[PDB]
């Protein structure tokens, strides 16, 4: 496009009070409506979220897995 | 003969009144002292008398030169600007004019 030699009308970044107030009101109404839809949400949700686990690049992940084994064995022995 | 100067004062500039964004308060002026660029350097000049020397039209009691006297009160900001209080507030036209900071009252 010939933007550099013949630029068009600039798009103003100066807001108006009317548009600022209207955007704030719409954002508040959207928050209320989203809260209402979340309260009436019929989609199934898990009781416990899925844990990501331990990252593979953590250098002592195998040692942490060993500690988990030792802890569960000690818990089973105590119980 | 002698080729030296006779200056025993330090040069300063009258920048502005004490002010916010919009409101100004002429009872306190802001002075930039030459060579003073921090609060530690400005602490030396606290209490020093400062004269604004100007010229008038009419000769009154032997002279056309008038003086407004004041003192340095406290540092201002972080860049060595100081606040000064004069007997009368300095003229608003003198923003950018020069002032004389004396070496008295001395504690050296």
């Amino acid at each position: 496009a010939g933007t550099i030699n013949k630029p068009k009308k600039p798009t103003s970044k100066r807001k108006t009070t009317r548009l600022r107030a209207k955007i704030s009101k719409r954002a508040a109404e959207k928050k209320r409506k989203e809260r209402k839809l979340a309260r009436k949400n019929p989609e199934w949700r898990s009781k416990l979220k899925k844990d990501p686990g331990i990252p593979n690049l953590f250098p002592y992940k195998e040692r942490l897995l060993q500690q988990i084994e030792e802890e569960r064995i000690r818990r089973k022995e105590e119980l | 003969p002698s080729e030296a100067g006779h200056r025993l004062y330090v040069k300063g500039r009258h920048l502005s009144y004490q002010r916010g964004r919009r409101n100004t308060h002429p009872k306190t002026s802001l002075i930039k002292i030459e060579g003073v660029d921090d609060t530690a350097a400005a602490n030396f000049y606290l209490g020093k008398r400062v004269a604004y020397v100007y010229r008038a039209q009419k000769e009154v009691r032997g002279t056309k030169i008038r003086v407004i006297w004041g003192k340095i009160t406290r540092p201002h900001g972080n860049s060595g600007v100081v606040r000064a209080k004069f007997t009368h507030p300095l003229p608003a036209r003198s923003f950018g004019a020069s002032v004389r900071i004396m070496l008295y009252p001395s504690s050296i």
């Binding site: 030699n5 | 040069k11 500039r13 930039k32 060579g35 923003f95 950018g96 004019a97 020069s98």
Partner: protein, 203 residues
């Protein structure tokens, strides 16, 4: 800080807005400023962005009469720097007009500023400010591309000034060499207690 009768600033290699801000503050504090070589000022970013901004500026004009009230688009590089400075000064007040009367701006180095000390402002110097690899342009190139007519005249005059400066520098080097020889020869004829006392004081 230091108060001077007039500070002459070589505009080569300085960034436009930062130099303008420093110069406007000095003018309002009451210091007289002369800027030379405004055609050698720099603007950060690519040249086409500066060109786009100047063409966008050229769009604006009073619709019912372009001879009055309209933005008068000055194309000389010193006038571009002057517009940048005037935007940072309350020019519609008497104090701002008085501050603007303490400034002079030129293309090239007209005499007698060719034989005066030219200072630099390190807070506005491009080699110290811009990150390496970032683009920058020249105000003189912008001025030539938007219709300044005197790029070649200023270039020829700067070439003659630099040739005369080369002759002056040859004489200056000869004078410095003779001064070093004079000090070396005179060091035998100064009293050793005088020399030792000066050395102990640091001179």
């Amino acid at each position: 800080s230091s108060f001077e009768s007039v500070v002459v600033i070589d505009g080569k290699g300085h960034l436009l807005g930062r130099l303008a801000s420093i110069v406007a503050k000095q003018l309002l504090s009451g210091q007289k400023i002369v800027v030379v070589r405004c055609e050698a000022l720099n603007i950060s970013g690519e040249f086409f962005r500066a060109k786009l901004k100047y063409h966008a500026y050229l769009r604006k004009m009073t619709r019912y009469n372009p001879t009055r009230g309209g933005p008068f688009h000055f194309r000389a590089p010193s006038r571009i720097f002057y517009k940048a400075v005037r935007g940072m000064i309350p020019h519609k007040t008497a104090r701002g007009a008085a501050a603007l009367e303490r400034l002079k701006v030129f293309e090239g180095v007209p005499p007698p500023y060719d034989k005066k000390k030219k200072m630099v402002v390190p807070q506005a110097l491009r080699v110290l400010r811009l990150q390496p690899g970032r683009k920058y342009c020249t105000v003189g190139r912008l001025s030539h591309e938007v219709g300044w007519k005197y790029q070649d005249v200023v270039a020829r005059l700067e070439e003659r000034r630099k040739a005369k400066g080369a002759a002056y520098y040859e004489r200056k080097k000869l004078a410095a060499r003779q001064l070093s020889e004079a000090k070396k020869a005179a060091a035998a004829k100064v009293d050793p207690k005088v020399s030792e006392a000066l050395a102990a004081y640091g001179y």
